[PDB]
Structure formats: C-alpha cells, structure tokens
Symmetry: D3
Subunit: 243 residues, 6 copies
C-alpha cells in the first residue's frame, strides 16, 4: 500500500491555482524566504492543506515570467519521520509537470578558501544519513526499483549557473555536498573526516529531496548558501536563461 | 521473545528432503540461478513454505557429489525489513548442519584494473549500512552477545579458491567489500569515498548474511561477480577439493 | 509528548538520598565497577526503580569528599532501543545539579603506539552510529533544537586530567573517539577506515551520552581504558583538584 | 493530533463539483445503488480520491431538484478499522453544508409481522458493537466531548416519511435498530436476545454513522430494507416534501 | 513485561507525605471535589508527577481523623487508553496499605422512583464495556489469573452505609450499576434494554476501578450521585463508624 | 496479507505423523486432558512447533479406531491476542481433512436444575465478547465474507449425542451457551442478565473456535462440563457410532 498524497495534492492545488503548469520547483531553505515575495500573481497554500507536505507554506505563480512553484520551508531527517519526509512533496512537483527542482539550503563549508557568504553549486553528494528515501516497497507509479545518480546534479543546468554568476560579478564554486543527520552540529573531527572523504560542503538536508527527485526522473539543480542578494540574482538570472 | 523460524524450517525441510545433512550452503545472487539447475536429485521448496525466509525458493541436493543446500534469491536491507532479513535463513543453514556458507553476489568494482566480468573473492568488508544484524536482545541459542569478525572470510577456504582459479585459467583477485544500503546506486563521490576508505568492491548485500553467519559460528566464503561460466567452474572446482 | 522520567527520578532519588546535591556524575563502563565500592555513605538504587534508566544500579555518595552520583552500567545502541537509550539518565544528572559528566568506557586502540592497558582522554569524537540522540521533537525543557559540539570534551577539565597523570606517573594520551554500532566487533578494513578517517580510539558507547549531555548543557570529560589502578588514581586525583 | 481528511475532501470536491452546496447526504447500502443513477448532472468521485472515505464512489448532483450528495457504498465495523470508519465521511457531509443524513441499509427483521421486502423507518437504536465512534480525544472542531442521542432519529423528518408512505401505498413501520458486529450472521439465540432486549431490526451498520452524525450536529433519518421500487418512491417523495 | 508504576508512585508519595499509611482510598467523580477541601494536613500531588495516574491531582491526609488518600479526577474508558486506565492507580492504593476503596461517581437512574439528587449505594454491576481490565498477561504480584466478583461491593460496608443514611435523614437505595462506554450518552432504547436486563443505575466508569480492585484483593464500596451535602455527610458518617 | 500458519502446520505435521488423515478434531478444555492418554499410536507435537497454535500440545492418533487429532489446551480471548486466537488452529483441522470439530470446555450453569458434574450439549450460543473472529479482511482461501450460523451446532451429531447418553445412563441436557470475556468471573447481576437473555451455560471460550469453524465449513459439536468418566464415555460412544 502506497501514498496517494501527491495525487490528492494535485487536485487540491487546482482549486487554488487552476490551469497552471509550473516548470521549475523551488525549495527555499532557512533565511531564503524573501524571494517568494517577488512571485507574480502569488497564491499561497499552507502545508497544512497539502497532505504529505512537511508541516513545520507553498507559493505558486510566475517569476521572471516563468511558471514556478515554491516551497517556503522543508522537512529534515532530524525531525524524526525518516528519510522519506520530502518524498511526497517532490512527487507532487513531478505530477504538477515541473521539469526541474531548484533546491537551496543553508550550509557549512569544508574548504577554508570558501567562506561565509559564498554560494556553492552542488555537483554531487555523499550521504551520511542512515539509509535512503526509496528504502521499502517501490512505487512503480513514480520510478523503478533501482536507479542511477549519475549526473544527479545536472551538468547542463550547472553550466548555465556558471554563466549567470559570471554575468553578475560573484564567484560560484562547485562542490560535493555531504549530508549529516543532525540536529546537533558536526564535531570538528567529523568535519576533518568529511574533508578526507572528499566533501566540500556539509548540511542537514538536500540528499533526501535529490534522491527522491532522481527516482521519479525530475532533474535537479542545487545551490548552498555558506553560513559559516547574490542568491536572488543568481536565481533570477537562471530563470531568465531558461525561459 | 525470539524467533523459532529456523526450528520450524528444520522440520518443514525434513518433509521434503528427509535424511539429508548438507555441508555447504549457497546464496545465489542475481543472474546466478542457472547453477542450481545442476543439482543432483534436486528438491525445490518455495520460500513461501519456509518461515523467516526472504520471500522475493530453496533447493536441496548434491553437487559434485556434495550434499548442498542452495538459496535462489536473497533478502536485502533496501527492502525495508532492516538488517535482520537474512538472519533466520542463515540460522537455518547452521541448524541443518552446514559447515560453511558460500555467498555470491553481483557487484561493482572500485578498482579500474578489475572490470566487468571479473570475479573477486572477498577477504573482508566495511559496513556502511545503518546498524547491524545482531542489534537487539541476543539469542543465546545461536551465539554470544559479542563476537569477532577476525578471519570472517575464512583464509583457508580462500586459499583453495585461489588454487581452483589457477586450475581453470582465470584471475581471481581478492578484495575488501563495502556494503551500501541502496536501492539507489552510489553517487560518484560516494564511490571515491569508498576508494579512499580502502574498498575494492561495492554492493547492497553480503554484510547482513556474513555477520549473521559468524555470530552462529558458521564459516564463510564469498565471491562477487563484477557487473560494472568462470563462476560455475570455480564453484564446482571448490566443491571437488572439499569433498 | 515528552518523557518525564528524569523528573520522576528526581523525586524517587530524594527518598533514598535526601538533601544531596551531587557535582559529578560518573558512568562506569565494563570492568570499572570496583571504584563505586569506595564511595562514602554509599546508597545504591537499582536501575529497576528509576524510570528511563538502562536496565541491564546507581550509587550516590561522596568520593574524595565530593558529592558524587555513579552509574554502574550503561545502555548501548546495540541493545535495540535506538540512540536515546542514555538520554533520560543524563537528563537526570543535569536535574540533580551535577556540573559535569565523567564518562568512562572500555575501548580499542587505533594507534600501535597506544596499547592494551593504556588510558586515553577523549578530546573529540566521530559518530558512526545511525542518526543521533536528539533526532525527533525537541524537548525545550532541556535544550535547544540545534546545538554546538565545539569543546564538547571540555578542554579545561582535560588539562587537569593531564596534570593528574603527570602527578602519579603514567601516560595519558589524548584522542579522537569514533563510535561503532556493534554488537559485532569491527572488521579489520573498518579499522583501517577509521584510521584514515582520523580516529584514535574505537568503541560502542560514549557518543550517545555525550551528545545528550551537551544538549542539556552539562559539561563532559571522557576517558577510555584500552583493552586491546591507574584509572582509579586518575579519577581520585581529578576529584581532589576540583574539590 | 486529529484527522484533517474532511477538510481535504472539501477542497478535492470543489474541483469536481464547484459552487455546489448539497442539502441532503445519502448512504446507499447494498443493493440500493440503482438510485444514484437518477441524479441530475451526476458527478462521480471514487472513494480512492477522497481521503478518509471507506474504500470498498461518491455521487454529487440534484434529485427531485434538490442538491444532493450520495455515498454508493459504506464502511463497516467488521472490516477491522474500528467504529470510526464512517466518521470522516460524515464530517465531510457536515462541512459540505448538508442539513441531514439519509442513511439506508439492508437488514433483518426481529418481528414476524414485518417480513422480507418491508421497509422500516428507524426511530432509535441499541448498540451492540464494542465501544463507540467518539471514543478517544474529542475533536472540538466538530463537536463536544459529551452529547445526547435524544431524538437522534429526527421525529419531524420521520413524520414526513410516514406521510409519503401513505402517499404511495405501502406500510412504513417504525422500529428500534440494534447493531451487530458481524461479519458472521447472528445466532438464533442472539436473535431471541435482541427481541427480549426491545429490538425490531438488526444490522451490521448504521450506528457508527448515526452517532458520528449526532456528534457534529447533523440531523439523521434512517430506513432499513428488510431482506429476511417502494424505497425509491419513498426517497423521491421525501425529497419532494422538503424541497 | 509489567507495569512498575505503582511501585514508582509509592516512592514518589513518600517524598510528599512521609510515614503515612492511609486506610481508605477515595475516587471523587465529577462535581464531587469540594470534599477534599476538608482534608486535614492536606498534601496535593498532581497526577503529572505520578506515573500511571489518569492525567485529565491526588490528595493525602486525614478526614474524620482517618488516614485517607483521594483522587480528584478519574480516567474513563471513553478516553481511548482501554479498560486498564484506572488499574495502576488502584494498585497504588493497595500498595499504600489501604483496606478499602470508596468509589463515587455521577450517574443516571434507570428507576422512575429514584430521581435527580438521590444517592444510590451500588450492590453489584453489569459490564457493558468491551472486555475487562485484567485481559492480557496476569501480574502475579497483584493477583491471580482468575478471580471472583462475589460480594465485590462489600455487603458489610454497605450495611454501615445504610445505618449512616438513617442517621442523618435521607434515603439510600441500593442498586445494580451497569457500565456504558460513552462518550455519547445512552439512547432511550439502550436505556430500556438496561432496565430489562436488571440495572438500576447507568454510568461511564466504576467497573474498571472495581474489577481492578477486586483482582488485588482491595475491598470496595461505591455510591452514585444521581444527576438525572447528603453525599458529604454520608462519607463523613461512614468514616466515623470505621475509625 | 494473510496467515499461512495453517499451511505450515500441514507440512510440519506430515513429518511427525505421515499418511494420516484425521476425521475428528478435539479441543480438550481444562481438566479434560486424561482422555488423550488413550489415543492409539499417540504422537504428541508441542504447540511451540506449530505456528499459529495457542502456546499456553497436539496429539494425533486413533481412538475407538477413528483417526483423530486432539488439542490438549486452547487459547482464550482473555489472553490478549483478540478473538482470532483459535482461528489458525481450526483452519489447520480443516486442511488436515477433519469433517468435524468436537469442542469441550469447563463452564458454569445458568439453570438450578443442572448442577456441578452435569454435562450439557450446546445447541446454540450468544456472543458477549467484543467483536468476532472473522472481523478484518476475509481470507477467501478458507471461507466467504458473510456466513450463516444456522445449525452451527449440528443437529444431526447432537441427536447421536443424545442416543449415546441414553446408552450409558446419564442425562445430557441441551443448552444455549453464552460467552464471557473474563478473566474475572461473572458478577451475580451479569448472571441474572444472562438468564433473562436466554442462556443456559456460561463460559470463556467456545465462541471463537466455533465461529471460526463455521466460516471454513467445518461441522461442530460442543459439550460443556458443568463445574459449578461420563464425559469419556460419551466421547468414546459418539466415536463408535460414527466409525
Ligand atoms: N550540518 C550543518 N548544517 C548547517 N547549516 C548551516 N551551517 C551548518 C553547519 O556548519 N553544519
Ligand atoms: N550497490 C551496487 N550494487 C551493484 N550490483 C551490481 N552492480 C552494482 C553497483 O555498481 N553498486
Ligand atoms: N567496538 C569495540 N568496543 C570495544 N570494547 C573493548 N574493545 C573494543 C574494540 O576493539 N571495539
Ligand atoms: N446482521 C445482519 N445483517 C443483515 N443484512 C441483511 N440481513 C441481515 C441479517 O439477518 N443480519
Ligand atoms: N452514561 C451516563 N453517564 C452519566 N453521568 C451522569 N448522568 C449520566 C447518564 O444519564 N448516563
Ligand atoms: N466464565 C466462566 N467460566 C467458567 N469455567 C468454569 N466455571 C465457570 C463460570 O462460572 N464462569
């Protein structure tokens, strides 16, 4: 027996935003909400009206003239509902017709050279959380039993990201993201461990969403804001080039 | 309260294959079933008639004149029933009187030098799946609370494996297996991480079975078929030398 | 809904040891019980009378004239009740008024230079067990949603530990502890992995207790007895310097 | 934590049947489906698209020119999901704006004088199923902790039912319904017991729906078809008089 | 595995009310709290500090110079925690050393002759709630697997109750109590059913407490206040005669 | 997902008692074990080796030259595993090929005229336990969703029972059995209620087994030993007449 939540959400969303087919889905991490404020004809639906959504709202509309859907707030593994916490919502994005997920998140740097305030485009990841989202019976309605994470962080969209960054005057390093369960922060040794292992950025999310997206064949693009304006411009510039 | 499934299986098996004491237990991974076709006086019992067995069949008989039991199909961690999924079945092998488990599995190589089509004898492992099979109350009927994994992959049988490989004309490299939860495949970074960590082969099984076997003092021998005739000969030749 | 066990324990303990405010809390690992025998006016309460305590006793009294509470026996992740197994007990120490937790444990060395019989002061840790103690809804009564593990193993108390060791004639090396789920022991490859990762000591506990302690702002001090008199003197000398 | 299913259903229903405020809600028992075939501008929604609905469809439209909602199929206690199986659906009727529930069901007679083919208007009930629908935390959003079942089977609507029956030429006896868990049928002694107790009709449903309805202040009208055209006319005539 | 809550409560209670051995335990139903206000040297403990107690307080002290323990508030079957909801608390009364339970409760009359305002001494009961408190593994520490309810409502104490009632000028009828699950009130037919069955009073509690009391050999006395000063005098007079 | 326990038991039983097709299945209540001692070529299997069987043994063999299976010990509702506790075992009897279940049990009389020591043939029953065995998804492999209890206590076999009783010189009264959950015994009022309701005998079992038997079309015969040699003769005489 599988979840029908995405299907329910499709119908509930038609009620608040009819005849709307979004192309890009966004997940706005921590302090990144202020962007959704600029959505054209913005319609907000509380996650409490969308079954399966990570109750702590979702905003539908246009940005740079592109039909977009946004998630103001995400779910994390540390909340206690396992690695499947972001799966229904991602499946909802796929069923809505989106062609790509634009994930954003607050994170720590594992490189001295990249400090607080920097933005990092994620090119791959190392999962350290226990297990994975698709563990359990496979939902054939969304994807196959086994699946590849090769090019999970779409190389093509990443190249566009690089161009936009040029285009506006800020670095945009590319890195390997390594997930951490939390909610406690990482010990210094764990951090050294992560460097040795090959990581560049460390955080408590992303991996669940991304693996879930790949399973249902939704393309991914992810950018971390290193916490220890540029982001808005990067996003709006990316939107402009894909319009 | 503990599982009595192995005990039940012993009695159920006497009904289909009386007065039979197998010496070697096999787990035939993915495309490796065709071997069981060559078992002498083969009797097949569906896993649905054996409590505790990983319902997706078990074949009892003789091979190279050696009393053998053989699992066509195994259980994995990614199925959602935790790390204990292969434990009852291994305990059943021990109670049947087997003296060694011959585990086989499909896997990926972490060494460029060993490619698709190669066979690798596992000499050790690195567990990356969350937790382990014996976590929880200890079943004193099968083994002790704590136990060593030293020489888990029996050095002696491994040496025989090396001889047989000579004996038939194919390389038989030895490696460290590192388990991965799945069901998604590994990211490239995860793969690099595994190299750095010391691994040679990567897969989604083995570890549960092997740790379970060691706990009840069942000797182990494991060979991976790198997927990204020789196997049959290796197995039959090993059987011949232990007869 | 949260656990009230620590609160219950406070009242139950007043009954056996009234008007007593301990300053240091101890966790005596495996063969380390004989120390509790030297507690002044020792009162022993079975863990079976203390809700939340890891039923396999707790001893309250004075040592070197310092009000102390001691756990003879701890809980481990391998027992099957998850990473929260030591949390209620640590919260009980905090509510009793302790200002520091003195954790002890049996462990293996990852350095050739430090062998069986050595004592190692833990200066940091690398968690390898699945998830962490605070995963799930946060208990605001004890600590915050997020928290830092910086200086988790108090540098100050560690310096005192160094002095005492001088003071009595034995080495006291400092190391990074890396937790392992167990109950099986580590494979040799896993051990190599741990070296590469940066570890110095390996064990099956500590991490749960320590993270739990930090969450409720209880200072920590941890010493491992490498298993593959000095300990008593170190503890008693530390007590003397903090009196 | 309470169910939000009724709320979800409201939004899902707006999508298939916008600007529609039904006044009467029907539950069509066993062989009573053929009535829904006569609904004007009938829109059918499968219970699989309505969270909380007893998956074995719901039909919205007009009948005798009255805005109506109809459940083709109900849930029973014997299915194993307890006495709350019909609660979400009834709450959905209340939230849709219905002013009365018209429950129908197949049943057995406890009076010799009323035989197979007869119709009986239920005037009260005796619950024999274990417990009741509202057992557990009270959902203040729908009703109060305690509530009266006085006049549960609305006397007023029952009088209208009596008139219509005159009006078309068939008896319409009034009786006390006594619920039975099932799924087995009643023993003869149980049946005698029910007579002695004061019952007139016996069945395996009704009680859950009715108690749930009363809790959220939804008026009720119930008619049993004794199994061991008139019904259609009675319903259509009742509708005509309340239009 | 059994509940140790009563044992915990014993120790927690020693802390707030040391060297106190109560003889009578009271359960004050609905509007009956005002009595506890007259307890001598009253000590109140919130049910939130007593594990196993029906969180919606407990008062210990003397009344008519008799050591007494009171429960201001009880647990009911309709709350959703089954028929064992009052068991731990009753066991706590037994372990405290009480020799009798004085249960009180608000109830409805099944006899026209006994109306609102009347008091009825319960002489027996008919359980209509699903199952019973002792269903499941038997706790040998408190009572036997099977036990008799003969004279459950102690005839001797009931006779004293009759004398006191004379003694103060009010009727005191004796009746059979029949429990009802609730939380809804009874239908009129259910009420007729109860009359036919032999009942005199109807309510939503009592039975759980009483059966639990009998299992651990605690004597019982129960009085219902029919809701559809005398009570205080009856209680105080009973206390006086047993002092 | 359904239970396969009966199927497992079939195979396990072939191992201890091959080529054996029993015709009558017995359930020996309390003090009734001594009968199984007289089974010809008796083979005993502990319920611990038969999945689904009510662990507190099963005896297979011949009696009066009739192939028989016999349960020494049954499961009851009061044990806490619900009304399905005897279902797997009864299904096992059906699959073994039995044509009738001969249930026996210890019970109380509701008639003054029938006292301790009497035997009563059950002709019908009144279920007072919460719910019934078949509640939940129906196992089509054994029976239908709905089923009749008419002639549940086979009239034909009952007539034979009457003859045998003549034949040996003892009364054999026929009665209506009414089940009671227990484990406490019935109150006197409950007993009066049972009389009024139409019962003749009262007990804590039978109903689960019997309803389960009827569902899978197994004929039933039940005899209660009123507790508040003749039985052996009745059974052996019945066997003789059906041989
Ligand atoms: N895990 C983790 N999450 C973060 N979010 C922001 N900074 C950090 C950090 O250093 N670690
Ligand atoms: N985890 C894992 N399992 C495999 N089975 C076959 N190939 C692979 C691989 O690359 N990775
Ligand atoms: N995990 C682990 N725990 C230990 N406790 C004592 N020695 C060891 C060891 O080598 N490994
Ligand atoms: N319980 C029950 N339900 C029915 N539905 C139709 N007839 C009957 C009957 O006799 N009993
Ligand atoms: N069940 C029930 N409880 C009550 N408490 C007070 N009055 C009543 C009544 O009529 N019925
Ligand atoms: N329920 C019940 N079971 C019994 N078993 C033997 N006697 C009795 C009795 O009086 N009541």
């Amino acid at each position: 027996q599988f979840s029908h939540n995405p299907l329910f959400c499709i119908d509930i969303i038609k009620t608040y935003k009819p005849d709307f087919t979004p192309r890009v889905a966004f997940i706005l991490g921590s302090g990144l909400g202020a962007l959704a404020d600029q959505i054209e004809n913005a319609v907000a639906i509380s996650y409490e009206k969308l079954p399966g959504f990570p109750v702590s709202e979702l905003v539908l509309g246009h940005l740079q003239g592109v039909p977009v859907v946004c998630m103001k707030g995400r779910g994390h593994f540390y909340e206690g509902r396992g690695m499947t916490i972001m799966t229904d919502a991602i499946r909802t994005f796929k069923l809505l017709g989106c062609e790509l997920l634009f994930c954003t998140n607050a994170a720590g740097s594992l490189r001295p050279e990249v400090g607080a305030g920097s933005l990092v485009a994620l090119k791959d990841h190392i999962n350290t959380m226990p297990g994975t989202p698709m563990v359990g019976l496979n939902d054939d309605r969304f994807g196959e039993r086994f699946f590849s994470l090769a090019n999970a962080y779409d190389a093509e969209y990443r190249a566009l990201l690089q161009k936009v960054a040029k285009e506006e005057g800020f670095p945009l390093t590319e890195g390997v993201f390594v997930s951490y369960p939390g909610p406690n922060f990482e010990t210094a040794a764990e951090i050294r461990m992560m460097q040795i292992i090959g990581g560049d950025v460390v955080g408590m999310s992303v991996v669940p969403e991304v693996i879930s997206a790949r399973h249902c064949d939704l393309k991914v693009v992810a950018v971390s804001a290193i916490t220890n304006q540029n982001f808005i411009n990067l996003i709006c510039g990316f939107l402009r080039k894909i319009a």
